[PDB]
Design a protein around this ligand. Structure first.
Ligand SMILES: Nc1ncnc2c1ncn2[C@@H]1OC[C@H](OP(=O)(O)OP(=O)(O)OP(=O)(O)O)[C@H]1O
Ligand SMILES: [Cl-]
Ligand SMILES: [Mg+2]
Length: 750
DNA sequence: TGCACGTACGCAGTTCGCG
DNA sequence: CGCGAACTGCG
């Protein structure tokens, strides 16, 4: 099984290293035969003699073209002649590629920014995480104090906990009387003892929770401060903190640092992504949290450290347990894209698609299009196109509602109509499909590039859903639900990639064709079910709609909808198909993207309401839920009013826990780049001045204090909140949090 | 190491600025 | 003192 690749330099020449686990043994393979290269499109073949003359420099040594070879390839499925330009070292490519492109005889250059080690995985056709090998995993976490004004790594690590299949232990240099705590003398010994533990256990995988920016980065930053040779790599090297543009990431040669945090970010949508919140969401059990205030007190007083040692142990314990569940799903994703788990587990979804596209392109001798420069990137960001069809919903309460939904609409459209950049307005074909409204044409004589890849993803999603019905255990069902959602996000990201300004295979024409087809399919389907079947469509969005036969009983609507399904599915071509997605007794639709229905089991599912949205306090989420209960279940408009007025009286008497009072909101950019400053940004700008690092992705949890003026002026983070000292704004939570969400359900006056 | 900068659109709703 | 911009996050 391939674990990762990198390269080292030997006698000025690159040497690929292939880290593998084969038959339960770690191994490094060496390849000194791979030459860095990129392509050049020349106006005339005779110019190759001038192109060979172009030189450049890096750190004193001159960079030359080592060798050239004229190859025949395809660009968007059309034959093209280009020159393969070879070079001695990978670092030569960034130094000379610009000067090579600007030559007047060079039309363009291609595939000039592929990292050497990942270029190797594609060209030689290796797939990481392939094969039947069991990987050993070891989680760890550190406990570290931080005063107001302390810099990075200036504080000592108090505790280093770790966990695997054999249990969990804590290492510390203060005496704690616990059978899973090993008390050493100093911090250096504790760090050295941890180094010995990992070398002894020799895990293939090191699991952390946001260790890229905290635990692993701190531990290494401390090892440089005390002068500890933290030889963690299996090649005898130290963990290396890697600059990843805005963020940093920790790599350990020969192992795999699995940082669960970025994985969890793009799998589960949570209000906050603390280790405690993630554990409860995944395993359905709560996890107590010990805050830096109690760790500072227990460290200073010397009492209650057993409570802290327990917290530290559980950090590593739940990190192993979470890592145990999410590593195989990330491994399968690594197998598809054909890139190492270390990279795949930290990549954006757009990057995963492109790397897979790059591999597939090489497989078919297709020259890759280049990423856009700064100007073309700005142009694509400025252009857009029409999206999903949305219908203003029918107001009032409706009964016997059926929800009909298209199955993987956008991928189905891409496959069925062969929407791809190599098929768009392609001349010389005998059959075309014409995109409605926009009029783009797509060749159908051969499977298009992206359409030829989407089928397997859809089949992979249905197989997981098949297992979901055969799943008895509720935990395996939840994890399967995660997996099929990740595939659905990935498959639909192929459509979105077409509109991604940074995409190599950018295709605005493809993206607006998919939506146009999606609009025509859902709109004509609505017309058909209404005019031919007497249904009344209550609410419709991009690929699905709610409908009913007004006045007909539950069974009648239920069977006419099934009859309608067979009727249009025989009319729809290719992979397009409507699904019977669910039946609901009653329901109503407040506005676009906001609704709530109740099923035959009296379970109330909602869409787009404040119940699921981040930014609304829990007492606001709770009050809307109970009002929806009194409406959709009991049908008591007056009961919901009594719930609201009673909750508002709880707020005025300060009878509410400040826990139900927290507002969560995320930063989406650099704090210096915010034009306007909202409450979560005003708070975030404060913690930025207090030393707490805030970056795109940080979730602020604040409470609004009693005052008059801007909300951001009286906002305070939940950490520093003291219920005895601080008094929240009772009027704000009544009038701005609790009341508007329930008011907007104004079927009756209020 | 020299890659990543985070798949798309349509839209409800809040804070804030300022007239 | 109503509204437009800035912003977040839903489906
Ligand atoms: N994150 C997304 N990015 C781009 N397009 C998307 C996304 N989510 C949905 N779409 C597209 O928007 C329309 C449609 O929404 P469904 O949420 O219904 O996802 P399927 O339809 O794919 O699959 P199912 O019905 O669950 O089998 C989907 O094609
Ligand atoms: Cl060799
Ligand atoms: Mg669908």
């Amino acid at each position: 099984m391939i674990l990762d690749t990198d390269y080292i330099t030997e006698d000025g020449k690159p040497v690929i290293r292939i880290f593998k686990k084969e038959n339960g043994e770690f191994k490094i393979e060496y390849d000194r035969t791979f030459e860095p290269y990129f392509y050049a499109l020349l106006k005339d073949d005779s110019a190759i003699e001038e192109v060979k003359k172009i030189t450049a420099e890096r750190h004193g040594t001159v960079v030359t073209v080592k060798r050239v070879e004229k190859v025949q390839k395809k660009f968007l499925g059309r034959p093209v002649e280009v020159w393969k330009l070879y070079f001695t070292h990978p670092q030569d490519v960034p130094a000379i590629r610009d000067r090579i492109r600007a030559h007047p005889a060079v039309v363009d250059i291609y595939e000039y920014d592929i990292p050497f080690a990942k270029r190797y995985l594609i060209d030689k056709g290796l797939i990481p995480m392939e094969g039947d090998e069991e990987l050993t995993m070891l989680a760890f976490a550190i406990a570290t104090l931080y005063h107001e004004g302390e810099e990075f790594a200036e504080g000592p690590i108090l505790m280093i906990s770790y966990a695997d299949e054999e249990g969990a232990r804590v290492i510390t240099w203060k005496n704690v009387d616990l059978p899973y705590v090993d008390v050493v003398s100093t911090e250096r010994e504790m760090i050295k003892r941890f180094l010995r533990v990992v070398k002894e256990k020799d895990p293939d995988v090191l699991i952390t929770y946001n260790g890229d920016n905290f635990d692993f980065a701190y531990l290494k930053k401390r090892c440089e401060k005390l002068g500890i040779n933290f030889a963690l790599g299996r090649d005898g090297s130290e963990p290396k903190i890697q600059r990843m543009g805005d963020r940093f990431a920790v790599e350990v040669k020969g192992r795999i640092h699995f940082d669960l945090y970025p994985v969890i970010r793009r799998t589960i949508n949570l209000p906050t992504y603390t280790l405690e919140a993630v554990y409860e969401a995944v395993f359905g059990k709560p996890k107590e949290k010990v805050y830096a205030e109690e760790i500072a007190q227990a460290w200073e007083t010397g009492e209650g450290l057993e409570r802290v040692a327990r917290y530290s142990m559980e950090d590593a314990k739940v990190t192993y347990e979470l890592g145990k569940e999410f590593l195989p799903m990330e491994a399968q994703l690594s197998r598809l894209v054909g890139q190492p788990l270390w990279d795949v587990s930290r990549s954006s979804t757009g990057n995963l698609v492109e790397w897979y596209l790059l591999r597939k392109a090489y497989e078919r001798n297709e020259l890759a299009p280049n990423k856009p420069d700064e100007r073309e990137y700005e142009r694509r960001l400025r252009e857009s196109y029409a999206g999903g069809y949305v219908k203003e919903p029918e107001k009032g309460l409706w009964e016997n509602i059926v929800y009909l939904d298209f199955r993987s609409l956008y991928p189905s459209i891409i496959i069925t109509h062969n929407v791809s950049p190599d098929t768009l307005n392609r001349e010389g074909c005998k059959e075309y499909d014409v995109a409605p409204q926009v009029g783009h044409r797509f060749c159908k004589d051969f499977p298009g590039f992206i359409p030829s890849l989407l089928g397997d993803l859809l089949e992979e999603r249905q197989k997981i859903k098949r297992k979901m019905k055969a799943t008895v255990d509720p935990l395996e069902k939840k994890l399967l639900d995660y997996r099929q959602r990740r595939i659905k996000i990935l498959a639909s990201s192929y459509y979105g990639y077409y509109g991604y300004a940074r995409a190599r295979w950018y295709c605005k024409e493809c993206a607006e064709s998919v939506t146009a087809w999606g609009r025509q399919y859902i709109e004509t389907t609505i017309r058909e079910i209404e005019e031919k079947f007497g249904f009344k469509v209550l609410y419709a969005d991009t690929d699905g709609f709610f409908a009913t036969i007004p006045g007909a009983d539950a069974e009648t609507v239920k069977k006419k909808a099934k009859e309608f399904l067979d009727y249009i599915n025989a009319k729809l071509p290719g992979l397009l198909e409507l699904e019977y997605e669910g039946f609901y007794k009653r329901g109503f639709f407040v506005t676009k993207k906001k609704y709530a229905v109740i099923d035959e089991e009296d379970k109330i599912t909602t869409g787009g309401l404040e119940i699921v949205r981040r930014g609304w306090s829990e007492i606001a989420k709770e009050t809307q839920a109970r009002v929806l209960e009194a409406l959709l279940k009991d049908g008591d408009v007056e009961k919901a009013v009594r719930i609201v007025k009673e909750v508002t009286e709880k707020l005025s008497k300060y009878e509410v826990p400040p826990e139900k009072l927290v507002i969560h909101e995320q930063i989406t950019r650099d704090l210096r780049d915010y034009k306007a400053t909202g409450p979560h940004v005003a708070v975030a700008k404060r913690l930025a001045a207090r030393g707490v690092k805030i970056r795109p992705g940080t979730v602020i949890s604040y409470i609004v204090l009693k005052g008059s003026g801007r909300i951001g002026d009286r906002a305070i983070s939940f950490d520093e909140f003291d219920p005895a000292k601080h008094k929240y704004d009772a009027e704000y939570y009544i009038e701005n949090q609790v009341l508007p969400p329930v008011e907007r359900i104004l079927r009756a006056c209020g």
